[PDB]
Amino acid sequence: VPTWNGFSLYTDETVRNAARYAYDNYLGKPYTGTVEATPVNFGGQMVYRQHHGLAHTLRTMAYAEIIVEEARKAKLRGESLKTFADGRTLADVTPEELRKIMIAQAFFVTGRDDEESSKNYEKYHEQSRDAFLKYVEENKSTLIPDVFKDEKDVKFYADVIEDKDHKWADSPAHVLVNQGHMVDLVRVKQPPESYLEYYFSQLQPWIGSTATEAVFATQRQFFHATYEAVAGFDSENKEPHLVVDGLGRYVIGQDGNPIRELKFFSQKKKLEENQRYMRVDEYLKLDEVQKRFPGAGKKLDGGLPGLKEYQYLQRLNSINRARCENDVDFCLGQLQTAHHQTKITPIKRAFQSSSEKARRQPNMDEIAAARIVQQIMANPDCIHDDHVFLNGQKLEEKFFRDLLAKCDMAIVGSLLNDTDIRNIDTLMQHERNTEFHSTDAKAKPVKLGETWEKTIRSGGGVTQIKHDLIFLMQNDAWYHTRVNAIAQNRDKDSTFKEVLITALMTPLTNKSLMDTSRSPAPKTLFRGLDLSEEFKNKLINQAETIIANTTEHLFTDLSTEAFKQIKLNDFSQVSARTCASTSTNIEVPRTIFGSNTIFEILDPDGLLHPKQVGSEYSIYLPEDVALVPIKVSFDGKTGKGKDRHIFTLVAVKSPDFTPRHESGYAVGPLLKMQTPKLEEIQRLVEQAREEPDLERVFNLQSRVARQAKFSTESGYKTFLNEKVAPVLEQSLNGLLDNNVTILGKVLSAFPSDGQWSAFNSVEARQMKIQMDAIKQMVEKKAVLEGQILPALAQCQNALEKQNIAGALQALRNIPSL
Amino acid sequence: SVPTWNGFSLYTDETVRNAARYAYDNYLGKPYTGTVEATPVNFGGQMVYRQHHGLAHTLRTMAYAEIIVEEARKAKLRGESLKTFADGRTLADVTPEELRKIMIAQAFFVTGRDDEESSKNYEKYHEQSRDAFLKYVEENKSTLIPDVFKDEKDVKFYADVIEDKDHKWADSPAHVLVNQGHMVDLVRVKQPPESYLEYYFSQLQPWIGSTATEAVFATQRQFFHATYEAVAGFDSENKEPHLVVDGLGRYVIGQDGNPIREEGELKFFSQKKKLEENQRYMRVDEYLKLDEVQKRFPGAGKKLDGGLPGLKEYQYLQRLNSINRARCENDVDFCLGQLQTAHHQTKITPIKRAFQSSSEKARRQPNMDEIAAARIVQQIMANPDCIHDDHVFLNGQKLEEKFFRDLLAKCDMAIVGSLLNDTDIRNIDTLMQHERNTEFHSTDAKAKPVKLGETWEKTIRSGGGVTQIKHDLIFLMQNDAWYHTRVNAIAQNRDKDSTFKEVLITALMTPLTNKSLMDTSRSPAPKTLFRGLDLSEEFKNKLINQAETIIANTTEHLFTDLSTEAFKQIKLNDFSQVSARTCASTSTNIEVPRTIFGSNTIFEILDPDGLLHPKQVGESEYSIYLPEDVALVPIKVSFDGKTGKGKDRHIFTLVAVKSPDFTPRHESGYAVGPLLKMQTPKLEEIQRLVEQAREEPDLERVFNLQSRVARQAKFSTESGYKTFLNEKVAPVLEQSLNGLLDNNVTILGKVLSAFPSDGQWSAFNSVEARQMKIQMDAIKQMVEKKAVLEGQILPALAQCQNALEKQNIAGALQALRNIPSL
């Protein structure tokens, strides 16, 4: 199954011109015959060939395209398709070949003089053949050798148009033209079930059941797009079955068994006593029919969903019907829109739908990670070379990589403020000489902060800073190449600071984008990548597998297999985790950057939220949006002679695409940073463990004993012996045993200021001062070990019992000594 | 060159006392048969026949001879050179056997007096005294010869000294001692006192030296006080006319009027004589200021008070007329006892002079390391589990061998023991079980090791309560040499190759043995204790001339204080540390160390001031623990003969003296240090309080609850549970989360009042509504925990510490007590 070159009925000018010439010189002209020569009028515009005209012709061409498309899918799914003489299959049809088919299809009905299909078949097809050759001859210089290879080639496609011997299974050419003509024959004729089953069974051997359901489902959409009525389907319908081949009937005899010789009966032939034409419901139930037709037990609604009879009938009588029959560019534009929708509809069908187009609200870790980023931005002093040290906690390379991979950094950026944006400059000043290395190894290291201040920043308020951050990531490859690789976890030999900067800048860049972007989101963006031959080939294979398992259906929904294959082959991560640069102009990645890989990202449901850059836009992929492939084309070669492919991707949002991360990664380290130092308390326990100053007590004991005894004043000597000395000996023992009971009692025994003031001697006064110091000494230990320390212990105890009102009580109600 | 004295004494020798007893009975106690001063005199009713030249006089002469020879021997050891006799000997060479013969002769020197004549019947009285002595020897020849006197030739020699035929008062030691001794008693209260004192001082001086002569006349005045005689004052500036004493004459100053010389040389004008108008008598104050007098007599310019210090004049006379005066003149055993007390005091007094005085006899109060040592000893005793082979491990601290040797050396164990109780004593049994197999080693390395705790349990202890344990511990220390030799060696820091546990036990037992002793003893403290030692010959001889050096430099004095030399020699030669640092065993019976133990060294420990505080061991046996400021100063060394093994035995007489100068200097903190570290609080409650405040909020729980509330909300169940969830619950959870993401206590305190009441929840009874209330209560408790901690408790504790750090204890308590409500 070769890779398609992107050839399309809706973009090829050669085929489009063959459809004009056909319309312009036949087809748009009045019938010269008798049968239905009378024109019909739609919305005031006339149609000369309502039936076999332009809209019919263009649809046959459109059928051939999708029949080939579906065959290539069935082949890739492992299905065996009907082979020709040379062993080829409809899937082997080439772009060049298909173009020659459509050109011939454009003339397959030009040679009609009226609407007689019971005679003149030979003459009309001879005229169509002449009309086609006349076109080829007129544009001889153009069509050969580029379209047709020689006159023998032209003769071949003229032979298919003439249809002398009805060899409708000779070649892909004969089949596509015959099948394309027959698919348009499913309209409203009753009973609809007999017609549908017949034409279904004609196409089925060539491309398979899954592909045949897709064609007739798409055919109904092409009818809506070109304003033709669409029939309903009822497997339980009680009408008599219509044997399409010959317009006959099958009959039920009295054995109650379908008459078989199965036996064809003419609508004229008379039936016996107990004979009755088999009904369609009986026909759809036959083991042979159910085996080739999945219509049994199923139902389809006619018309358009949302429209009622009178509304649907008014639509059919619109001028747009006439425009489809008269305007080539219009009828092709209708089909193109319908064809494109059949690629998207089955995808949306296979996944849980959502009504929210916005990013979800922050989770707990995104909130925590936002707090951490804000703190780092405020304290760039916390930035080292191996790590970040912030509030008694160490954050290393692993932490910031986990943030880059688990957090939606657009959501984190929505939690940041203009203070954080202003603090970018100061981070940059702190990292003035931090070297950033481009992923291109030839490149010389660039000083981060210095380059920021010297060539990018330009003063101003916060909005200017945002523009300069967006400017840096847009225009400085030494910066963005490293950042993108670290964000997507595909980097080699990155410094911790390169990783940290990425983790800090990515949410801040998203904020800067959301705050500055003004324009409404474009719905078609282009992205350029340069991939290895090995990696691109993987993506090509994953895309083709997904496309092959995404098909429209009539009766058999294969959404479960589309789900399975998409989750197996999804490569959305290639455009995720970073501020990905895109353009509305395909020539930016294609011609300027010369990329071998081009993503045509389609976002018709507005799910990507692209922010304008400084035609550049920036994409930060939401966690639950997948970029599902619908088309893979070979686009020729780049400047360096490498193959170039375009991946057309459609944005689809679903809870099914949501990743499951285990939480805690950002909340954890945040909690540990809120941990209180409590240095006052740690200083209370060190003071409560200080040894008492006993030498001070001894010194005064000695001083008292020296004057206890060397003075002839009797009152002073007694005072020292009965009032001073015992208190000191009592205080010494108290501080030595650390006995609270003895300390708190000696407090009252300390003589008053007035008892000391009785002696106005020099030594008595100095002793007073030293006695006061000891008293303070004794008191601070009596209150600590006696009042305060017990209270704290009582407080703590009520806290581990969760008696909060009791913990406060232990501090409020302190018993006195 | 000075032979060791054999302890011969006037106060203990029986022969001399007998001679004095005979002299009184037959002569001195009988009335004078003469004319002058023959009339008896009363003192307190008792009659005294011979007031001047009687028994008290005769016994003092004998006391002078003793102190003269004593001071002469000291003078020689200080290196002084004494006047020699014809045979080349000095008074320091006088032997005990010879001194006894002299004292016997001295006893009769006055017996032949018929009255108190002056210069009339010298030869008659001295012949009668001689015949009295001959009569006494003959009547006692069987005992006196040849033990005391060699032969009749020897007896005749001392008889010839008594007769005094040729006035050869410097012919021999006997002549000098008898003649000087008789004169020394003439230093009475006669006027002028200065002329008499200078004279008799100059006669003795050449024989023994100035230092000795000063000691003899100082002691003399004490002998006078002890025998109730009047003691004269001394005044260098006395204006009264000088009396020459040899002649009872005067000297004369001319009109010149420098004293009248010859040749220069002084004269001797008879007091009867009659001279010129231009001349007057040389004053006492003029005599003492002469250059010739000042070079031979150190007492000008100086002064001596008369009478007894502390007594007035009226009290002195009521003492001089006491009945004791008559008892000294009539009772031999009484007068000798009076002199013995005075003589003994003259050996203690100069020692106390050389150091600071002390007032208090009792041990000092505990210091800070002794109080701490008692605690540590008590806690080791309470939990013997802390005892290891290499160290003791108490409350996080490691106590090693040096720590316990430091207690033994710096702490007064007796004081430490005073801080112990009966529980600690009772815990000895617990200690001994833990140390059941601990082996103790005697210093005697021939003895086998003994298992401490096993021997204690099976041999030493006898049951009963604490008092019996104390008795058992004391018994162990008294009788088991395997225990006490090791303990004493370690306590005194003179041991070798001791185990750690032996050191530990010594440090634990010493204060415990002291407490046991103090709690069980009830005897009044004796003042004479005897301690026996088995010393090497080298060590003893070192102690001997250490003691002899100290004794030779301790003298009484009149004018020249040599206290500083006493201080210097005592500190140099002190051996008090032989009896220190351990519970030392003593006895009131000298025969215990001498006979039973057969010690070659005996300490006669005297404690008249009650400084040692001995305790009775189980009788005559006592234990002393030497106080840190008490020295055992030697005053006497005697040769006592041979032991059982033919080794020489010596007796050291030591006096307990207390002084701050003996106080050792140790750095504090050797025990207080480790104790304080064992009391450092490991404040676990506060540490838990801190860690509680470090516990993290379950933010995920609050966020997940928001999800549930929303998902519970978008289905209308009960009326109006949905509106309740959207308008009352959800905002609170949003505010709680934002208040917990930030540490904003103001948001947290506010949202607490915003949580729905139970009454509001009571309106909804669905399974999911009750399941929501329970979750909501958990979030509320989560909010409250931090709103109270960060908002009230933690800042209260911070403001408390800040007030304590500023030493504002008032504000520290207000920090806890004045906690404002949210």
mmCIF file with all atom_site columns, C-alpha atoms in Angstrom, chain A residues 362-364 367 371 663-664 667 670-672 674-678 680-681 683-685 688-689 691-692 694 729 732-733 736-737 776 779-780 783 787-789 792-793 795-796 799-800 802 804 807-808 811-812 814, chain B residues 368 371 375 672 675-677 679-681 683 685-690 692-694 696-697 699-700 703 740-743 784-786 788-790 792-794 797-798 800-802 804-805 807 809 813 816-817 819:
data_model
loop_
_atom_site.group_PDB
_atom_site.id
_atom_site.type_symbol
_atom_site.label_atom_id
_atom_site.label_alt_id
_atom_site.label_comp_id
_atom_site.label_asym_id
_atom_site.label_entity_id
_atom_site.label_seq_id
_atom_site.pdbx_PDB_ins_code
_atom_site.Cartn_x
_atom_site.Cartn_y
_atom_site.Cartn_z
_atom_site.occupancy
_atom_site.B_iso_or_equiv
_atom_site.pdbx_formal_charge
_atom_site.auth_seq_id
_atom_site.auth_comp_id
_atom_site.auth_asym_id
_atom_site.auth_atom_id
_atom_site.pdbx_PDB_model_num
ATOM 1   C CA . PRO A 1 362 ? -6.113 23.620 38.357  1.00 0.00 ? 362 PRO A CA 1
ATOM 2   C CA . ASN A 1 363 ? -5.467 20.417 40.300  1.00 0.00 ? 363 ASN A CA 1
ATOM 3   C CA . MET A 1 364 ? -3.767 20.467 43.700  1.00 0.00 ? 364 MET A CA 1
ATOM 4   C CA . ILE A 1 367 ? -1.649 25.045 42.448  1.00 0.00 ? 367 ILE A CA 1
ATOM 5   C CA . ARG A 1 371 ? 3.404  28.673 44.541  1.00 0.00 ? 371 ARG A CA 1
ATOM 6   C CA . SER A 1 663 ? -0.560 13.326 42.833  1.00 0.00 ? 663 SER A CA 1
ATOM 7   C CA . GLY A 1 664 ? 1.708  14.717 45.550  1.00 0.00 ? 664 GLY A CA 1
ATOM 8   C CA . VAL A 1 667 ? 2.178  19.500 46.996  1.00 0.00 ? 667 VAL A CA 1
ATOM 9   C CA . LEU A 1 670 ? 5.526  22.824 49.187  1.00 0.00 ? 670 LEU A CA 1
ATOM 10  C CA . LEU A 1 671 ? 4.261  21.580 52.559  1.00 0.00 ? 671 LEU A CA 1
ATOM 11  C CA . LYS A 1 672 ? 7.824  21.091 53.815  1.00 0.00 ? 672 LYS A CA 1
ATOM 12  C CA . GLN A 1 674 ? 5.749  25.956 55.144  1.00 0.00 ? 674 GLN A CA 1
ATOM 13  C CA . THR A 1 675 ? 7.488  24.226 58.058  1.00 0.00 ? 675 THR A CA 1
ATOM 14  C CA . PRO A 1 676 ? 8.065  26.784 60.862  1.00 0.00 ? 676 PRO A CA 1
ATOM 15  C CA . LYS A 1 677 ? 11.614 27.310 62.137  1.00 0.00 ? 677 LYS A CA 1
ATOM 16  C CA . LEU A 1 678 ? 10.408 28.252 65.631  1.00 0.00 ? 678 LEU A CA 1
ATOM 17  C CA . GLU A 1 680 ? 12.450 31.336 69.870  1.00 0.00 ? 680 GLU A CA 1
ATOM 18  C CA . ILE A 1 681 ? 11.309 28.005 71.305  1.00 0.00 ? 681 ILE A CA 1
ATOM 19  C CA . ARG A 1 683 ? 16.207 29.211 72.314  1.00 0.00 ? 683 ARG A CA 1
ATOM 20  C CA . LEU A 1 684 ? 13.921 28.536 75.283  1.00 0.00 ? 684 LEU A CA 1
ATOM 21  C CA . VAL A 1 685 ? 15.074 24.923 75.575  1.00 0.00 ? 685 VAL A CA 1
ATOM 22  C CA . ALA A 1 688 ? 16.373 25.943 80.276  1.00 0.00 ? 688 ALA A CA 1
ATOM 23  C CA . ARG A 1 689 ? 19.381 23.619 79.993  1.00 0.00 ? 689 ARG A CA 1
ATOM 24  C CA . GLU A 1 691 ? 23.759 25.169 84.385  1.00 0.00 ? 691 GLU A CA 1
ATOM 25  C CA . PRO A 1 692 ? 23.078 27.514 87.328  1.00 0.00 ? 692 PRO A CA 1
ATOM 26  C CA . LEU A 1 694 ? 26.995 28.521 91.435  1.00 0.00 ? 694 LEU A CA 1
ATOM 27  C CA . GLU A 1 729 ? 23.096 28.353 101.625 1.00 0.00 ? 729 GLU A CA 1
ATOM 28  C CA . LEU A 1 732 ? 22.945 27.113 96.688  1.00 0.00 ? 732 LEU A CA 1
ATOM 29  C CA . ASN A 1 733 ? 21.308 23.804 97.605  1.00 0.00 ? 733 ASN A CA 1
ATOM 30  C CA . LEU A 1 736 ? 22.347 22.387 92.975  1.00 0.00 ? 736 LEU A CA 1
ATOM 31  C CA . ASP A 1 737 ? 19.520 19.884 93.447  1.00 0.00 ? 737 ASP A CA 1
ATOM 32  C CA . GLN A 1 776 ? 16.826 37.191 90.120  1.00 0.00 ? 776 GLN A CA 1
ATOM 33  C CA . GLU A 1 779 ? 13.509 33.441 90.634  1.00 0.00 ? 779 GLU A CA 1
ATOM 34  C CA . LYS A 1 780 ? 14.025 32.739 86.919  1.00 0.00 ? 780 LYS A CA 1
ATOM 35  C CA . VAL A 1 783 ? 9.391  30.221 87.397  1.00 0.00 ? 783 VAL A CA 1
ATOM 36  C CA . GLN A 1 787 ? 5.466  27.507 86.384  1.00 0.00 ? 787 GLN A CA 1
ATOM 37  C CA . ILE A 1 788 ? 6.334  27.805 82.685  1.00 0.00 ? 788 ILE A CA 1
ATOM 38  C CA . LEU A 1 789 ? 7.859  24.427 81.765  1.00 0.00 ? 789 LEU A CA 1
ATOM 39  C CA . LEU A 1 792 ? 4.120  24.004 78.201  1.00 0.00 ? 792 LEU A CA 1
ATOM 40  C CA . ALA A 1 793 ? 4.108  20.270 78.930  1.00 0.00 ? 793 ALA A CA 1
ATOM 41  C CA . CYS A 1 795 ? -0.267 22.392 76.750  1.00 0.00 ? 795 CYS A CA 1
ATOM 42  C CA . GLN A 1 796 ? 1.478  19.823 74.542  1.00 0.00 ? 796 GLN A CA 1
ATOM 43  C CA . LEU A 1 799 ? -2.604 18.907 71.891  1.00 0.00 ? 799 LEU A CA 1
ATOM 44  C CA . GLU A 1 800 ? -1.890 15.209 71.281  1.00 0.00 ? 800 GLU A CA 1
ATOM 45  C CA . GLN A 1 802 ? -6.659 17.225 70.441  1.00 0.00 ? 802 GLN A CA 1
ATOM 46  C CA . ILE A 1 804 ? -7.494 22.464 71.805  1.00 0.00 ? 804 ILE A CA 1
ATOM 47  C CA . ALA A 1 807 ? -4.067 23.459 75.460  1.00 0.00 ? 807 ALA A CA 1
ATOM 48  C CA . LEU A 1 808 ? -4.899 27.168 75.604  1.00 0.00 ? 808 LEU A CA 1
ATOM 49  C CA . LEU A 1 811 ? -1.201 28.613 79.252  1.00 0.00 ? 811 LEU A CA 1
ATOM 50  C CA . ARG A 1 812 ? -4.025 30.839 80.510  1.00 0.00 ? 812 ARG A CA 1
ATOM 51  C CA . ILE A 1 814 ? -0.978 29.268 85.594  1.00 0.00 ? 814 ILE A CA 1
ATOM 52  C CA . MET B 2 368 ? 29.657 22.929 97.159  1.00 0.00 ? 368 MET B CA 1
ATOM 53  C CA . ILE B 2 371 ? 27.333 18.525 98.886  1.00 0.00 ? 371 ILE B CA 1
ATOM 54  C CA . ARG B 2 375 ? 24.503 13.265 96.062  1.00 0.00 ? 375 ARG B CA 1
ATOM 55  C CA . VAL B 2 672 ? 29.788 19.926 91.181  1.00 0.00 ? 672 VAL B CA 1
ATOM 56  C CA . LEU B 2 675 ? 26.504 16.523 88.887  1.00 0.00 ? 675 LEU B CA 1
ATOM 57  C CA . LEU B 2 676 ? 25.085 19.538 87.045  1.00 0.00 ? 676 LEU B CA 1
ATOM 58  C CA . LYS B 2 677 ? 25.482 17.671 83.744  1.00 0.00 ? 677 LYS B CA 1
ATOM 59  C CA . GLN B 2 679 ? 20.641 17.138 85.849  1.00 0.00 ? 679 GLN B CA 1
ATOM 60  C CA . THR B 2 680 ? 20.423 18.711 82.387  1.00 0.00 ? 680 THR B CA 1
ATOM 61  C CA . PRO B 2 681 ? 16.747 18.408 81.331  1.00 0.00 ? 681 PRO B CA 1
ATOM 62  C CA . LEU B 2 683 ? 12.709 18.258 77.777  1.00 0.00 ? 683 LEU B CA 1
ATOM 63  C CA . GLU B 2 685 ? 7.351  17.383 75.958  1.00 0.00 ? 685 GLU B CA 1
ATOM 64  C CA . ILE B 2 686 ? 8.502  20.698 74.493  1.00 0.00 ? 686 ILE B CA 1
ATOM 65  C CA . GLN B 2 687 ? 10.359 18.833 71.733  1.00 0.00 ? 687 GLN B CA 1
ATOM 66  C CA . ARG B 2 688 ? 7.114  17.007 70.906  1.00 0.00 ? 688 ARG B CA 1
ATOM 67  C CA . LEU B 2 689 ? 5.361  20.382 70.989  1.00 0.00 ? 689 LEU B CA 1
ATOM 68  C CA . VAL B 2 690 ? 7.795  21.643 68.349  1.00 0.00 ? 690 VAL B CA 1
ATOM 69  C CA . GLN B 2 692 ? 3.645  18.856 66.338  1.00 0.00 ? 692 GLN B CA 1
ATOM 70  C CA . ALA B 2 693 ? 3.856  22.373 64.914  1.00 0.00 ? 693 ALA B CA 1
ATOM 71  C CA . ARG B 2 694 ? 6.005  20.990 62.091  1.00 0.00 ? 694 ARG B CA 1
ATOM 72  C CA . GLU B 2 696 ? 1.933  19.243 57.583  1.00 0.00 ? 696 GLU B CA 1
ATOM 73  C CA . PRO B 2 697 ? -1.680 19.993 56.595  1.00 0.00 ? 697 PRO B CA 1
ATOM 74  C CA . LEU B 2 699 ? -4.129 19.872 51.565  1.00 0.00 ? 699 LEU B CA 1
ATOM 75  C CA . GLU B 2 700 ? -4.974 17.033 49.178  1.00 0.00 ? 700 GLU B CA 1
ATOM 76  C CA . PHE B 2 703 ? -8.913 19.743 47.697  1.00 0.00 ? 703 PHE B CA 1
ATOM 77  C CA . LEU B 2 740 ? -3.649 26.745 54.518  1.00 0.00 ? 740 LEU B CA 1
ATOM 78  C CA . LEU B 2 741 ? -1.742 27.221 51.249  1.00 0.00 ? 741 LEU B CA 1
ATOM 79  C CA . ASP B 2 742 ? -0.623 30.540 52.656  1.00 0.00 ? 742 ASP B CA 1
ATOM 80  C CA . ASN B 2 743 ? 0.022  30.503 56.393  1.00 0.00 ? 743 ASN B CA 1
ATOM 81  C CA . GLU B 2 784 ? -8.281 25.022 64.186  1.00 0.00 ? 784 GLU B CA 1
ATOM 82  C CA . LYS B 2 785 ? -5.021 23.176 64.930  1.00 0.00 ? 785 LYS B CA 1
ATOM 83  C CA . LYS B 2 786 ? -3.002 25.722 62.930  1.00 0.00 ? 786 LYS B CA 1
ATOM 84  C CA . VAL B 2 788 ? -4.503 28.147 67.390  1.00 0.00 ? 788 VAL B CA 1
ATOM 85  C CA . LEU B 2 789 ? -0.836 27.159 67.065  1.00 0.00 ? 789 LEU B CA 1
ATOM 86  C CA . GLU B 2 790 ? 0.369  29.820 64.610  1.00 0.00 ? 790 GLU B CA 1
ATOM 87  C CA . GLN B 2 792 ? -2.061 32.071 69.624  1.00 0.00 ? 792 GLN B CA 1
ATOM 88  C CA . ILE B 2 793 ? 0.246  29.478 71.211  1.00 0.00 ? 793 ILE B CA 1
ATOM 89  C CA . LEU B 2 794 ? 3.458  29.793 69.164  1.00 0.00 ? 794 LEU B CA 1
ATOM 90  C CA . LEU B 2 797 ? 5.695  31.121 73.666  1.00 0.00 ? 797 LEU B CA 1
ATOM 91  C CA . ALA B 2 798 ? 7.863  33.405 71.530  1.00 0.00 ? 798 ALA B CA 1
ATOM 92  C CA . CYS B 2 800 ? 7.555  34.559 76.750  1.00 0.00 ? 800 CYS B CA 1
ATOM 93  C CA . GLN B 2 801 ? 11.085 33.680 75.647  1.00 0.00 ? 801 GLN B CA 1
ATOM 94  C CA . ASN B 2 802 ? 11.671 37.266 74.506  1.00 0.00 ? 802 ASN B CA 1
ATOM 95  C CA . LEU B 2 804 ? 12.910 35.940 79.666  1.00 0.00 ? 804 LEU B CA 1
ATOM 96  C CA . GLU B 2 805 ? 15.804 36.910 77.380  1.00 0.00 ? 805 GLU B CA 1
ATOM 97  C CA . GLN B 2 807 ? 15.091 38.986 82.234  1.00 0.00 ? 807 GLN B CA 1
ATOM 98  C CA . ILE B 2 809 ? 9.864  37.430 84.342  1.00 0.00 ? 809 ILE B CA 1
ATOM 99  C CA . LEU B 2 813 ? 4.088  35.147 82.574  1.00 0.00 ? 813 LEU B CA 1
ATOM 100 C CA . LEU B 2 816 ? 1.249  32.963 78.504  1.00 0.00 ? 816 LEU B CA 1
ATOM 101 C CA . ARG B 2 817 ? -1.624 34.346 80.581  1.00 0.00 ? 817 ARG B CA 1
ATOM 102 C CA . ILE B 2 819 ? -3.456 35.193 75.160  1.00 0.00 ? 819 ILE B CA 1
#
